[PDB]
Amino acid sequence: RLVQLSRHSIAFPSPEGALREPNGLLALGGDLSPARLLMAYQRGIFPWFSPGDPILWWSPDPRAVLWPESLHISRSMKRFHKRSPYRVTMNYAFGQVIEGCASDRTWITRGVVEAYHRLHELGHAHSIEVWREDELVGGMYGVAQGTLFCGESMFSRMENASKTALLVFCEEFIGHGGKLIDCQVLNDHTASLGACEIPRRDYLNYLNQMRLGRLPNNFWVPRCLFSPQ
């Protein structure tokens, strides 16, 4: 039980055979190469380990998830956004976004940053940037999986920065066929946004269905999503 991955193959074990506690511990080792990383997201697996430990692969149950249209937005956030001081762009500065996420509280090691940077160069990881004038003040990134978006992490340096990043994204996302946003595990910030839990086999089905789905061919080209007043 709990398989040790081999650098030879890009294969993974059945998510269902994952540990129950720690929730979803399914394997360790291997590497963070595009093929394997990418293979993992297809199967609904994801890496998550601290500096010093070997690569830990997970596939929890339940699974945290966020329905784009269920994104809760308080009344004051709407007021704030109606006169937003922020500008939002897509794939303008993936590097800066991930480095910003990798600077808060730490589990985003130099290696993890390098790995997701490659999926960006190959066109699988994307970022949404939140700008306050000429300063990056927030954003988020993830790995697109068809009509499903696997949220990796966000960061904020200015009030409501990350919220406008996600609010705007959801609009753009939904508008073009976006279907769901994977959150992996539920936590305090993610929960206050409308994220919820559903069985691993429920999430896994969506994966198979949505991973085949397709958004506009140019949906991820870098551009501006929202301009301030």
Partner: peptide, 5 residues
């Protein structure tokens, strides 16, 4: 977004 907890 796991990296938030």
């Amino acid at each position: 977004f796991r990296y938030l907890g």
